[PDB]
From a paper:
In this study, we focus on chloride ion–pumping rhodopsin (ClR) from the marine flavobacterium Nonlabens marinus S1-08T. The conserved DTD motif (Asp85-Thr89-Asp96) of the bR family, residues 85, 89, and 96, is replaced by an NTQ motif (Asn98- Thr102-Gln109) in ClR. ClR structures at cryogenic and room temperatures clearly reveal an architecture composed of seven transmembrane helices (TM A to G). Cl− ions are transported from the extracellular (EC) side to the cytoplasmic (CP) side during each photocycle.
The torsion angle of C14-C15 = Nζ-Cε flips as a result from 155° (dark) to −65° (1 ps), and the retinal continues to change, showing a torsion angle of 187° at 2 ps and 126° at 100 ps. The distance between the Nζ atom and the centroid of the ionone ring increases from 12.7 Å (dark state) to 13.1 Å at 2 ps and then shrinks to about 12.2 Å as the retinal relaxes into the 13-cis configuration at 100 ps. The distance between Cl−1 and ND2 of Asn98 increases from 3.3 Å to 4.3 Å at 1 ps and then reduces to 3.7 Å at 2 ps as the sidechain rotates. TM-G kinks slightly at Lys235 on activation, with the angle between the two halves of TM-G increasing from about 4.6° in dark state to 4.8° at 1 ps and to 5.4° at 2 ps. At the 1 to 2 ps time points, the location of Cl– is close to Trp99, reflecting the dissociation from the PSB after photoactivation. The results also indicate that the structures at 1 to 2 ps time delays are mixtures of electronic excited state and the hot 13-cis state, while the structures at 50 to 100 ps correspond to the relaxed 13-cis state.
Residue numbers in the entry: 2 to 265
The structure:
């Protein structure tokens, strides 16, 4: 049902995809350890943001590693190419884990924006509904990514609509809660917002790929468009969100955040 099943792969194509995915496990897991060690310098009020990023890292990784084992499971070198065998490869769990990588993500954004209580719960609720709603509409079209391209174009459209609409919630909360933010990070939070738009349009670029490049190199470009997406929405919003918590902790008088910044 997915263009990946349609082709045989050069050895260079199959190896590049497999190193891509593996570089992936490597980075989500190495960043996994950074995210743990530095959590002891984040003040109690922000320390979950730090934590939330370990879930991101270990969702991702576990499922990224899943994809690379399935890639080698699915294909075997036969008469001069990698041909599809008895098991299949697909990108379902990405998505299926898109569906949960994000709650925790906008959650640790919302933490460092200093929201608390009811605005925090309420904002997170609407956000999860609409991201989730981007995530799932987009899931029903890549399902048609071979059979019915106008169903890619139509589900695409609707997911996008959901994407447009959700960057408004986040936009608004950021520009409205900038002023709350400590130790200089009111400037910083505007970068993460932008940082954040780039990686997430990579994925619609990553979706119209059957529509505009249905061949084996397109399969490759998807996955490339996949590994970067991931170093940014997961690994580098990751970090950037983390700096903000530590800086705000120092600004609010938390001595291990103060000493941590001082050391460097
Ligand atoms: C791993 C983390 C994140 C934040 C992934 C977010 C995904 C998007 C912004 C994807 C959007 C889609 C749309 C807008 C277009 C058609 C179908 C998609 C699911 C690829
Ligand atoms: C075997 C997997 C292939 C890649 C090996 C990965 C291990 C080294 C990767 C680089 C570290 C990831 C980025 C930096 C971690 C955050 C710590 C920091 O920025 O101070
Ligand atoms: C292999 C990784 C072993 C654990 C290393 C990271 C643990 C840091 C200890 C801590 O910060 O409490
Ligand atoms: C949330 C769901 C919102 C409803 C929009 C419906 C989108 C169109 C479905 C495509 C079905 C079809 O093309 O047959
Ligand atoms: C911003 C995220 C950083 C992601 C780094 C991903 C690294 C990709 C590395 C360089 C691409 C060079 C590709 C050469 C591939 C040719 C493929 C082929 O064999 O046909
Ligand atoms: C070419 C690569 C350009 C840089 C890409 C990797 C950057 C890592 C992001 C780390 C987040 C640092 C927060 C900013 C700190 C500050 O305000 O000075
Ligand atoms: Cl605190
Ligand atoms: Cl994922």
């Amino acid at each position: 049902k997915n263009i990946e099943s349609l082709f045989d792969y050069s050895a260079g194509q199959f190896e590049f995809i497999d190193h891509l995915l593996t570089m992936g496990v490597g980075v989500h897991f190495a960043a996994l350890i950074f995210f743990l060690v530095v959590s002891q310098f984040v003040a109690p009020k922000y320390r979950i943001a730090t934590a939330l990023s370990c879930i991101v890292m270990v969702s991702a990784g576990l499922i990224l590693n899943s994809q690379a084992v399935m890639w080698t499971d699915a294909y075997a070198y036969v008469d001069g190419s990698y041909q599809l065998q008895d098991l299949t490869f697909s990108n379902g769990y990405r998505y299926v884990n898109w569906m949960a990588t994000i709650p925790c993500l906008l959650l640790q954004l919302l933490i460092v924006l200093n929201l608390k209580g009811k605005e925090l719960f309420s904002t997170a609720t609407w956000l999860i509904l609409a991201a989730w709603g981007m995530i799932i509409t987009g899931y029903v079209g890549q399902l048609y990514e071979v059979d019915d391209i106008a169903q890619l174009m139509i589900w695409g459209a609707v997911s996008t609509a959901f994407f447009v609409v959700m960057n408004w919630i986040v936009g608004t909360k950021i520009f409205k809660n900038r002023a709350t933010m400590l130790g200089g990070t009111d400037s910083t939070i505007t970068k993460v917002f932008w940082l954040m738009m780039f990686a997430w349009t990579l994925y619609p670029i990553a979706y119209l790929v059957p529509a505009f490049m249905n061949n084996a190199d397109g399969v490759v470009l998807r996955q490339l468009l996949f590994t970067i997406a991931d170093i940014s929405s997961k690994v580098i919003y990751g970090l950037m969100i983390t700096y903000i918590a530590i800086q705000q902790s120092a600004a609010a008088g938390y001595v291990p955040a103060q000493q941590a910044l001082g050391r460097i």
